[PDB]
Design a protein around this ligand. Structure first.
Ligand SMILES: CCC1=C(C)/C(=C/C2=NC(=C\c3[nH]c(/C=C4\NC(=O)[C@H](C)[C@H]4CC)c(C)c3CCC(=O)O)/C(CCC(=O)O)=C2C)NC1=O
Ligand SMILES: CCC1=C(C)/C(=C/C2=NC(=C\c3[nH]c(/C=C4\NC(=O)[C@H](C)[C@H]4CC)c(C)c3CCC(=O)O)/C(CCC(=O)O)=C2C)NC1=O
Ligand SMILES: CCC1=C(C)/C(=C/C2=NC(=C\c3[nH]c(/C=C4\NC(=O)[C@H](C)[C@H]4CC)c(C)c3CCC(=O)O)/C(CCC(=O)O)=C2C)NC1=O
Ligand SMILES: CCC1=C(C)/C(=C/C2=NC(=C\c3[nH]c(/C=C4\NC(=O)[C@H](C)[C@H]4CC)c(C)c3CCC(=O)O)/C(CCC(=O)O)=C2C)NC1=O
Ligand SMILES: CCC1=C(C)/C(=C/C2=NC(=C\c3[nH]c(/C=C4\NC(=O)[C@H](C)[C@H]4CC)c(C)c3CCC(=O)O)/C(CCC(=O)O)=C2C)NC1=O
Ligand SMILES: CCC1=C(C)/C(=C/C2=NC(=C\c3[nH]c(/C=C4\NC(=O)[C@H](C)[C@H]4CC)c(C)c3CCC(=O)O)/C(CCC(=O)O)=C2C)NC1=O
Ligand SMILES: CCC1=C(C)/C(=C/C2=NC(=C\c3[nH]c(/C=C4\NC(=O)[C@H](C)[C@H]4CC)c(C)c3CCC(=O)O)/C(CCC(=O)O)=C2C)NC1=O
Lengths: 49, 162, 172, 60, 172, 162, 172, 162
């Protein structure tokens, strides 16, 4: 049974899964609340002071 | 974060003045050292799995008393969290290399480090051992200025732990 | 900021009358149960680290989105802020428990805290959940009959529950 | 009239900083404060509450 | 306040991911052209009095109502504040050109500026006009090929124009 | 004085911390830029006299009324003062080049400049035009990166005056 | 503060004449060994906790009268002050190493540290011994050729030992 | 040291008035409960050696790995220092009992504790376990309100360690 997917997409998938430690698992998912560390002070405009 | 460009701009602003020669030369140094730093980040990102699993194993070897039942390291969840934490440290080290300043490390790891560890009873010596292993492996993965950059940021993290 | 005594004094003063015999008896009964009150306050103060560690463990096991990348408790800084807030609210609950009045809690802790958590983009519902978990842990620690003379203390348990619930309802 | 107070920061102040902490940067123990007469009583009692020990108070 | 590197880092953190290869390549490209960026920042910084002088002259030639008794720049105080404002906006545009991200402007230079201008009664249209005049005067010094190696610096010109435009749009 | 290294050390001491990646990168930028700056200082020290003479004459062409009797530039003493002042500016420019920082120009010229010139009725435009002439012959005298360094320090001086 | 470049500029300004060719050559040599100087500073920084711990262990093994009750470093607070003083002295020494001038160490700290230690009751020879042990601990890390290219830095070792012994003699 | 009488004086002095009934009430409250605290102090001072040795053995039992070659427990001087440390903690517990205030503990242990432990790599959990043993023992060595006094002070120290 030959390659079911072209090599370019396999490479793209591998590099997407590599840039994340552990690949894609159920426990290492990003948080649905997408708040950067600087979220509050930046949205409030008080980062400088 | 407290990267070279940002601290330059912030100190210039706090004195209400433009960017003078001092600041521009600092920025030039940053843009030149980008090359070794981005190279170190590439090397560590390509090798993140081997680095992190080796670090976890090194921790479990220098701290044998952790794996047994009854304490922190026993259980698949706790070891998964170990690997996740070291992946965090290595991620933020590569971020520091890319940004050419300890800003990512400071903001994301060092601020609140001791209080969080005390609250969850996580011994800093564990992460010191993991980072020492990562330092050793980067001694082999990297050469020249890339090695110096990576080791500099790893040592910054270790000093923050101890 | 006032205790049960000063509360009674304020209600008497607005009318413009002496404290009634019933009010004086109520305050004297409060003073007579004050020893059990001190025991409960000491139970809170001694086991605060355990209470907050337990509530944090349950909160982050229940709500995993807070501790994962992007989550509101994710970097060490925000985790430390979360645990510190739990410390603070437990502290003010114990203050209120001693005073016999929630005025210190409401006035000095709870008052503008919803607005703070709205401005910072912190989930107020998650903070209320943390206050509730910390309530349950604190109740486990108060009811400990070890090292303390045994006797009925249901009034104190209910009062501490009211304080924790008031904190939760104000934050949320 | 102006009064110059040479205060030496001592162990009484060091204990207070060890308990409360350093919300302000650490400084040498011996420094001189200059006050008017109107301010002399509050400043000196404040230095006492802080635990600082005055060495010499000179008028000028 | 971010630069381009910290912006990339923040996105990568939200994904929970290391920086992808293409991201590192775009960043290496940014830093490899950093010398031209430094020259453009030097061109903006060194000629700032000239830029502000020319923008001011053109603005008060167009809009004489600003400098007539009753205008918003009439006495010396208001004219001095106006010139300081031009100084400040040029300063922050140079900061953004050095960092490569327009976050410094909205974080600091334009944080509450529109509200300030509304409460003082400043004509925001004239302020945006002043910023456009500074942009035009600045482009002259940015393209100045004297004393610098000839090269393609069109990305820098467009980026600086967008910083000036972001200002003049946030005020207006 | 304001150098790159001094900004490093003061930023590190103000936060009560050690020197680290961002600060060592700034210092490295300084050390890399030292070569053009020391070269420009050398070339400017060679030609101080011709530069000063030309700058004084440049002012006198640009502001001919100054040489008129009853004005500032009338009399040999006043022209000697002019030459001395242009020499002062040039010397502090060379110092700033050597230090890789505008600290020398700042401390020795710019601090107090406006009040002194106001008190003695010294038009800053005179010195601006003289520095313009010096900037002109810096292009001929210097090439490469020493050229850019000298020009940016001269532009710092001119911006301070204007 | 003052740097070696700043020092030379100050001396030239006192005599009011341009920096001589010999001065320019010395400063060019300094900038040439600046890379080695950066390595030495990084060596001091990256092992500063190790240096402090080694010096403290050797000092307290040498002098047990500080550990024992009634000593100058007996309670936890006096131990912490001891460690903080060692740390700050090391930090200033590394500052002097990076600048190449001892001004950053001599100006703010060593002038008043004498009066401070005399007032507090600290044994001054003990603190000088602590700084000497810090120097001895730091030399090993300065020598460590691992992770750096093999080279000669005898000037750097001489200067660092100079700063260490100068601070120790000042406090002495 | 923050004795309750001391805090009385400090608060009255800070508000700049004499001793009104409010803090006389608190001073009385201390003066009555001095008796249980002082008898608890005497009982602790009598059984000090057994308590210290039992705390050391509880530490080694809960952390068997410590005594093994290569780390803190191994080395007879290290067990000696362990015994001395639990002796110190017990001594300052007795001081805080006799003084009716956490003052002695605060200024003799807690002040500077974390930095000391971090610098010498001493685990606070060792001392938490030792004080847990001391609490368990004094649960039966004392009865009545003296037990409550001792437990409050021992647990204040425990919470300080954590
Ligand atoms: C942004 C940077 C960041 C870091 C570094 C970080 C570390 C971190 N790891 C944790 C969990 C953990 N991590 C470990 C690690 C141990 N597992 C053992 O196998 C090893 C010996 C050892 C690792 C070297 C353990 C045992 C826990 C569970 C602690 C608990 O909640 O009981 C926790 C508690 C939160 C949770 O419940 O997941 C934090 C805060 N968190 C962050 O946000
Ligand atoms: C130094 C600070 C201080 C403490 C620590 C303190 C505790 C304390 N609790 C007491 C009695 C008591 N304590 C309690 C409370 C208990 N009942 C249940 O077991 C609950 C788990 C728990 C409280 C929620 C009760 C019911 C009594 C006996 C009834 C009474 O005397 O009021 C007594 C009187 C003597 C005795 O019988 O033990 C004291 C001194 N008092 C103080 O001034
Ligand atoms: C209410 C207080 C107030 C004052 C005092 C004031 C003076 C003033 N005069 C100006 C223009 C000017 N003013 C002069 C005055 C010169 N003309 C020459 O014939 C003489 C030698 C000399 C006068 C003795 C000149 C030449 C300009 C044009 C400057 C320029 O276009 O750059 C400007 C610049 C903006 C403008 O009006 O176009 C100001 C602010 N403005 C004020 O709001
Ligand atoms: C002290 C602070 C400092 C500055 C300011 C600085 C500028 C600087 N300009 C450079 C050349 C250059 N400068 C420019 C920019 C100019 N090209 C013109 O056409 C445009 C008007 C303009 C902007 C587009 C260009 C295109 C180069 C050559 C290309 C390159 O170096 O990558 C270089 C590289 C040297 C070379 O390879 O020849 C530097 C380092 N360096 C510093 O250390
Ligand atoms: C400009 C930089 C700077 C320095 C250097 C400095 C030194 C300094 N050391 C101090 C106390 C101290 N310093 C030491 C250290 C010495 N005593 C011995 O035991 C050790 C062997 C030796 C350490 C090597 C100790 C133990 C104390 C505590 C004295 C006391 O609390 O009574 C204090 C009093 C403030 C306090 O205790 O909180 C200062 C100001 N302060 C500064 O702002
Ligand atoms: C990110 C911060 C940063 C650091 C850390 C840094 C260090 C640094 N060390 C270098 C090599 C070096 N490093 C040293 C110093 C070592 N040699 C001996 O082993 C001594 C034991 C030891 C001194 C303590 C020497 C002698 C060189 C070679 C310099 C030469 O002679 O050409 C180089 C030049 C490498 C090359 O281009 O070939 C740099 C840039 N630069 C930076 O921007
Ligand atoms: C009066 C307040 C005070 C306290 C509390 C105190 C504790 C203390 N114990 C120490 C040594 C030590 N302490 C220990 C304790 C360990 N030994 C093992 O058997 C156990 C697992 C564990 C004890 C439960 C060890 C191993 C050392 C030697 C390593 C070192 O810290 O240098 C040190 C480092 C310097 C010294 O030797 O004194 C301190 C500060 N010192 C004080 O001045």
């Amino acid at each position: 049974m030959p390659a079911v997917v072209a090599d370019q997409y396999l490479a793209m998938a591998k590099e997407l899964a590599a840039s994340r430690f552990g690949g894609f698992t159920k426990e290492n998912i990003p948080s649905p609340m997408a708040q950067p560390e600087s979220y509050g002070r930046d949205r409030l405009g008080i980062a400088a002071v | 974060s407290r990267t070279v460009i940002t601290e330059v701009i912030a100190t210039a602003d706090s004195q209400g003045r433009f960017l003078n020669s001092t600041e521009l030369q600092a920025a030039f140094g940053r843009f030149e050292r980008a090359v070794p730093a981005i190279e170190a980040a590439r090397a560590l990102t390509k090798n993140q799995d081997a680095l992190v699993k080796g670090a976890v194993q090194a921790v479990f070897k220098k701290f044998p008393y952790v794996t047994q039942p009854g304490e922190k390291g026993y259980g698949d969840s706790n070891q998964a969290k170990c690997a996740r934490d070291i992946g965090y440290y290595l991620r933020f080290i590569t971020y520091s290399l890319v940004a050419s300043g300890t800003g990512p490390l400071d903001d994301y790891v060092i601020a609140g480090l001791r209080e969080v560890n005390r609250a969850f009873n996580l011994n800093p010596l564990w992460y010191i051992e993991a980072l020492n292993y990562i330092k050793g492996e980067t001694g082999k993965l990297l050469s020249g200025q890339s090695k110096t950059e990576a080791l500099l940021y790893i040592d910054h993290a270790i000093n923050a732990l101890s | 900021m006032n205790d049960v005594f000063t509360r009674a004094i304020a209600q008497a003063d607005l009318k413009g009358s002496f404290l009634l015999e019933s009010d004086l008896d109520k305050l004297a009964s409060f003073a007579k149960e004050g020893v059990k009150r001190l025991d409960a306050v000491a139970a809170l103060t001694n086991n605060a680290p355990a209470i907050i560690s337990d509530a944090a463990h349950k909160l982050f096991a229940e709500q995993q989105e807070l501790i994962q990348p992007g989550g509101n408790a994710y970097p060490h800084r925000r985790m430390a802020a979360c645990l510190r807030d739990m410390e603070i609210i437990l502290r003010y609950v114990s203050y209120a428990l001693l005073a016999g009045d929630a005025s210190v809690l409401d006035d000095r802790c709870l008052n503008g805290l919803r607005e703070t958590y709205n401005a910072l983009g912190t989930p107020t519902q998650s903070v209320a959940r943390a206050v509730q978990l910390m309530k349950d842990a604190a109740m486990v620690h108060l009811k400990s009959t070890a090292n303390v003379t045994v006797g009925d203390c249901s009034s104190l348990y209910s009062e501490a529950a009211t304080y924790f619930d008031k904190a939760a309802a104000s934050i949320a | 009239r102006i009064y110059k107070i040479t205060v030496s920061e001592a162990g009484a102040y060091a204990t207070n900083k060890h308990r409360t902490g350093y919300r302000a940067p650490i400084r040498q123990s011996n420094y001189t404060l200059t006050v008017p007469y109107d301010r002399f009583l509050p400043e000196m009692i404040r230095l006492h509450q802080s635990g600082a020990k005055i060495v010499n108070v000179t008028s000028v």
